[PDB]
Amino acid sequence: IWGTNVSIQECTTNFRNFLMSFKYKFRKILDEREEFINNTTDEELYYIKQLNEMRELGTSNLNLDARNLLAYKQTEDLYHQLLNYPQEVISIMDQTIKDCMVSLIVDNNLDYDLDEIETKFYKVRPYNVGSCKGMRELNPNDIDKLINLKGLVLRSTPVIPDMKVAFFKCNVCDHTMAVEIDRGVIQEPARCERIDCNEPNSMSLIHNRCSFADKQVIKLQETPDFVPDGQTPHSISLCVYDELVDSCRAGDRIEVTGTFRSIPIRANSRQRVLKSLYKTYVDVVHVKKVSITDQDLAKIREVAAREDLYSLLARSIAPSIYELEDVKKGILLQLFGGTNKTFRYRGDINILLCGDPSTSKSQILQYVHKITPRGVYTSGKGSSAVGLTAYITRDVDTKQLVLESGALVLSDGGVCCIDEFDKMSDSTRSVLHEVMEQQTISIAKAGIITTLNARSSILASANPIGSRYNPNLPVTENIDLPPPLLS
Amino acid sequence: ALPSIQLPVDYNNLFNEITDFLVTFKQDKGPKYMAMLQKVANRELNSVIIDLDDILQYQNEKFLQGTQADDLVSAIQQNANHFTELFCRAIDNNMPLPTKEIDYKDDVLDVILNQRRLRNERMLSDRELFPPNLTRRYFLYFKPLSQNCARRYRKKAISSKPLSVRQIKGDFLGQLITVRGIITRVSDVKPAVEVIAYTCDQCGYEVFQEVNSRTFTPLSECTSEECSQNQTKGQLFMSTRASKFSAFQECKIQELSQQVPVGHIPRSLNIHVNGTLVRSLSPGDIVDVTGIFLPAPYTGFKALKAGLLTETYLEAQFVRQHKSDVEERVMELITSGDVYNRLAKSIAPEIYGNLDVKKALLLLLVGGVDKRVGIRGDINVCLMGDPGVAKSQLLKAICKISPRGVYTTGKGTAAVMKDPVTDEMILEGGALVLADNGICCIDEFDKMDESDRTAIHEVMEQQTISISKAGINTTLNARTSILAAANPLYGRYNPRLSPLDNINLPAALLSRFDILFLMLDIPSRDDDEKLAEHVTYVHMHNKQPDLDFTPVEPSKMREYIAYAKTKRPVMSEAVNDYVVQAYIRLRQDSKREMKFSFGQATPRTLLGIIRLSQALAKLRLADMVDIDDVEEALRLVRVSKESLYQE
DNA sequence: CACAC
DNA sequence: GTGTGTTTTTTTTTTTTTTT
Numbered sequence A: 001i002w003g004t005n006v007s008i009q010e011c012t013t014n015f016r017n018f019l020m021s022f023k024y025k026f027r028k029i030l031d032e033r034e035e036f037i038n039n040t041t042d043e044e045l046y047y048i049k050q051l052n053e054m055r056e057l058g059t060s061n062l063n064l065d066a067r068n069l070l071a072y073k074q075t076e077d078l079y080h081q082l083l084n085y086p087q088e089v090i091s092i093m094d095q096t097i098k099d100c101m102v103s104l105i106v107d108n109n110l111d112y113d114l115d116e117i118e119t120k121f122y123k124v125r126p127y128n129v130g131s132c133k134g135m136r137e138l139n140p141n142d143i144d145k146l147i148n149l150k151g152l153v154l155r156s157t158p159v160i161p162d163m164k165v166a167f168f169k170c171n172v173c174d175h176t177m178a179v180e181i182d183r184g185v186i187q188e189p190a191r192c193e194r195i196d197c198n199e200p201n202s203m204s205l206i207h208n209r210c211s212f213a214d215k216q217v218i219k220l221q222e223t224p225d226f227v228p229d230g231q232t233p234h235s236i237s238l239c240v241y242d243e244l245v246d247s248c249r250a251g252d253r254i255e256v257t258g259t260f261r262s263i264p265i266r267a268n269s270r271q272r273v274l275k276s277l278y279k280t281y282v283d284v285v286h287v288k289k290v291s292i293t294d295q296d297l298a299k300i301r302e303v304a305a306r307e308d309l310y311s312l313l314a315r316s317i318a319p320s321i322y323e324l325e326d327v328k329k330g331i332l333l334q335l336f337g338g339t340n341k342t343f344r345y346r347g348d349i350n351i352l353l354c355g356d357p358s359t360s361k362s363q364i365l366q367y368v369h370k371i372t373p374r375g376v377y378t379s380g381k382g383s384s385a386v387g388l389t390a391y392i393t394r395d396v397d398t399k400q401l402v403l404e405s406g407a408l409v410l411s412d413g414g415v416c417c418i419d420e421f422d423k424m425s426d427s428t429r430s431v432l433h434e435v436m437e438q439q440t441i442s443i444a445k446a447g448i449i450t451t452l453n454a455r456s457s458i459l460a461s462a463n464p465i466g467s468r469y470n471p472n473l474p475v476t477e478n479i480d481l482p483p484p485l486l487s
Numbered sequence B: 001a002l003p004s005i006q007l008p009v010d011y012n013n014l015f016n017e018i019t020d021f022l023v024t025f026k027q028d029k030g031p032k033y034m035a036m037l038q039k040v041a042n043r044e045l046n047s048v049i050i051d052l053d054d055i056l057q058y059q060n061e062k063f064l065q066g067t068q069a070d071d072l073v074s075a076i077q078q079n080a081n082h083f084t085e086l087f088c089r090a091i092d093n094n095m096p097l098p099t100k101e102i103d104y105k106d107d108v109l110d111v112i113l114n115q116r117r118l119r120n121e122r123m124l125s126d127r128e129l130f131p132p133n134l135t136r137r138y139f140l141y142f143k144p145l146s147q148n149c150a151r152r153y154r155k156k157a158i159s160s161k162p163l164s165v166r167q168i169k170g171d172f173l174g175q176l177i178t179v180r181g182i183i184t185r186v187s188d189v190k191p192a193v194e195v196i197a198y199t200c201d202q203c204g205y206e207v208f209q210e211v212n213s214r215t216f217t218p219l220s221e222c223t224s225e226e227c228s229q230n231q232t233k234g235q236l237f238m239s240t241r242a243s244k245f246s247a248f249q250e251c252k253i254q255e256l257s258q259q260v261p262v263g264h265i266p267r268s269l270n271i272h273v274n275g276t277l278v279r280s281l282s283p284g285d286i287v288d289v290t291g292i293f294l295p296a297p298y299t300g301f302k303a304l305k306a307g308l309l310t311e312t313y314l315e316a317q318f319v320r321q322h323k324s325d326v327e328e329r330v331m332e333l334i335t336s337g338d339v340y341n342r343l344a345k346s347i348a349p350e351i352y353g354n355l356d357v358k359k360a361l362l363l364l365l366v367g368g369v370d371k372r373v374g375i376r377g378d379i380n381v382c383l384m385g386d387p388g389v390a391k392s393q394l395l396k397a398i399c400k401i402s403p404r405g406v407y408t409t410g411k412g413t414a415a416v417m418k419d420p421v422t423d424e425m426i427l428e429g430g431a432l433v434l435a436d437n438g439i440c441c442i443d444e445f446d447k448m449d450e451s452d453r454t455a456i457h458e459v460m461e462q463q464t465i466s467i468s469k470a471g472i473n474t475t476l477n478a479r480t481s482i483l484a485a486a487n488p489l490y491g492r493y494n495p496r497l498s499p500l501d502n503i504n505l506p507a508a509l510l511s512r513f514d515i516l517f518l519m520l521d522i523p524s525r526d527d528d529e530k531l532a533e534h535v536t537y538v539h540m541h542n543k544q545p546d547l548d549f550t551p552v553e554p555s556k557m558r559e560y561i562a563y564a565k566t567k568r569p570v571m572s573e574a575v576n577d578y579v580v581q582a583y584i585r586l587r588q589d590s591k592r593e594m595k596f597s598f599g600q601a602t603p604r605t606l607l608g609i610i611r612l613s614q615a616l617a618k619l620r621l622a623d624m625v626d627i628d629d630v631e632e633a634l635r636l637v638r639v640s641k642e643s644l645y646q647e
Numbered sequence C: 001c002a003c004a005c
Numbered sequence D: 001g002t003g004t005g006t007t008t009t010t011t012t013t014t015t016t017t018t019t020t
């Protein structure tokens, strides 16, 4: 390796002898894990078993823990160089993966297409590279270094095509040749590759006939529990290539590992004058989301056979809240709901919680929202997180007139937990009227006419007017809700 | 042509005297700066702080024995940029060898050095190569002169005098000056390239290009001797591994309110900090920054559009903030001064009366601790009061004494997104999140819109605010204790009118506050007289009429909270029993009262009582929650409830 | 305007 | 060597207008 005075062959041999002859007992004794008594999960060649699993499943990526290199003896300097020179180390890492797999295929007599193995590109995803470094502590000596970071992503760009292999066609003889592209530079041929033509300046790039890979920049935000309270959490630009695309939706609290790299930014697009800022990013190599079964069916039949299953489920609805037995029973029935009869019949339950202001009115709401798979909790008066109705807005970026969905839609089957149901605006009251009566939301604005199927369940909770609900006074005179919506 | 001028500075003699100063300075181990340079060689330091006082003392010493100086202290205040490079070259010339076994696992620059040295040497025998800045793993800064109090400060030592932004005339360009001011905007840390380290595809050569222009052009042409003689015309590849980068931050410091003449507008100044001085500043900093004042140019095409009218910035060199011994001292205060009574008056010494409100303020400052969930340790009070009562002064005092304490009016928090179009930054703060581990003093809580109503609500049952600019749903933590200072609508409070009818706030939000007090003023014969006496004395002496113990420092409360946060006074079984019968009888008397319906006892009142008892024991050692603690908490709660029913 | 295309 | 190309901006603040 240039710039490090490190031979590639010795590193490849170290990782090769680390692949086999290495057992998870090395990991168990490296961390001084007292539960080293396990033998099958420790003394077995874990990497060999992973190779067997990959061969029988035909996958590409490999999730390697950096601690395993410390566990092995000859791969300590390998770990050091990986921390220092991740690019070349990872390249030879994956090359040795492929070579060891083909060698294992040859040796174990496991018949398989060798060309299939060779053509397939196999990846390594080294995680747990180091301590939980803070992105605020990114001093500029971390360039070209493998870094572990923690944070919650803000947003994700769409799929970005980056051209990997060029495709030039000779416009005077229809000779098509492909040029490998490294570091994003065009090494266009000087003349036609065919000798009978060999015409210079006769090659035009055929954009749709080239080869393209997928780049997806993500916007990572520092996790709240580690950012200083005085200052807002900062943001970084994640880079995703060739895999893990859409593996992280917006809002995911994840631990990322990747190579921290920076590139200059052109001061003027037409010129090559370069600003001295060197916009930074990270080339992600692994992401961990830190956050149906026969045995499950057996559990279902066991709980069904229980005589008190009704009461048991009612208690499990709100274990921390006392009394409210019939409330729990009704909520459970709503989570079950009627059959969605087809031929329209709702086949669903709408429940409202009136009465004097009680904290339990919201506590059981959060409990049921956690319980229900679908649906979303929402404050009808507030609607801060979700607008409670689907409407079209201009996204600012590219100024596109994009439709965003409300809380009612996407909550089909599940329960959309409503709070402050009395205090919500009359416009969303009419929207609720539409969704509860017609079961669909009809929108006609900005040249767009559409009907969206909501088919949601409603569990609302509204506080009354005044200090508290008046039992002598009727429900209508205290909850301040339109009689059609109430009924 | 370029005309020439004669100037008596003598850079050569100055450099030689600089070397003599560095080698032969021993402050009142060996030389201090040789020790620092050896430590740098040990990789134990990469920050050379050149103190002006050391140079001045060296000049004082050698003046008595030969006058072998040219007033370097005054000579470098005229153009410090050249002397920075002079000091760098002097350090490199007198750079000691490492005297420690420093691990060279990451020695990429050393690897490049030895590799290129061997490559050059294998043809040198015929069988500067490196930039001076590239070899440097250190950075050099200047410490300004201290106060002189002598004839040497004969209007000289411009760095000793703290200037303001308006005092920075254009003639000061190139001088090492200092300013006193408050930051307003700090940028993020970014890698600014010092020297690029291009590598050629063939010819194997690596060429370095130093850049100080904020913008450059790539070489991409193998002008190396082998490539040129072979005419291979190789293109150069930029190499971050061998290139040199520096952490950079760009602050925007404004001038203080006192530095602004009447009828004027405060100005601003951009500061470019780099090296190890990055991340040393925050927007909420009032500092005396000393640095080099330089004319940042409009390099490019904009220079032609504008002309000789350039822009300026300060290359900062030094920053001085303005802003268990104390633990033993606060036990001494506890034993001597009765905190419950003495610190109550200490919070508002200039405010006469309402001592129980002051004690409630102490309890809020201490705060309960019930972080375990299955709640919250923030105590919240609302001061509806009465117009004309010094609620605003109490909030101002609380803000000036509570750490991370902020004050704002109901009508001006919230948050904003991408305020500057140019940088397009993300997630600007507000006012509620500023007092994250602090208290927000909300004056005019009544004159506060539904948007901020819901924001402060979400905060108070969540200890966190959230925004949904473009569906991002990002959130900012604000575990702020809520201190409201609304006032009754239509002016004066009406005792006959119901308290919730007197203020345009929802009853649900008001009940969720832990405690509330009616403190309204009533015209008397003596209380007004004594208050007038107090105000007149304050006007006489610019100080309070000290008639009792008046502690000043608020760090006593800091010690109390830090000490008892880990303690977490555990509620006793007797405590739980007494508070449960207290709730039973409170609800019973609330019903038997049913005169205002706001007097109903709620589990929220129980949570408030629990957190008040936690804060009470928190101020008083650990595990003081007992019959006495709950009695004090219930007494305070009942006093607050009867306050609403005053008269 | 002037350096880069 | 003749002739180019940038730097270069739409915020905040008034005023009007329709709903609400």
Ligand SMILES: Nc1ncnc2c1ncn2[C@@H]1O[C@H](COP(=O)(O)OP(=O)(O)OP(O)(O)=S)[C@@H](O)[C@H]1O
Pocket: B350, B351, B352, B353, B385, B386, B387, B388, B389, B390, B391, B392, B393, B444, B485, B486, B487, B531
């Ligand atoms: N008990 C007191 N001790 C000392 N000064 C007091 C006292 N009560 C009122 N003041 C004075 O009254 C002024 C403060 O009154 P404010 O707090 O502005 O009245 P207010 O009730 O807040 O009205 P606002 O601002 O409309 S809510 C200062 O000049 C104080 O010195």
Ligand SMILES: [Mg+2]
Pocket: B389, B390, B391, B392, B393
């Ligand atoms: Mg006031």
Ligand SMILES: [Zn+2]
Pocket: A170, A172, A173, A174, A175, A192, A193, A194, A197, A198, A199, A202
């Ligand atoms: Zn051809």
Ligand SMILES: [Zn+2]
Pocket: B200, B201, B202, B203, B222, B227, B232, B233, B234, B235
């Ligand atoms: Zn070359």
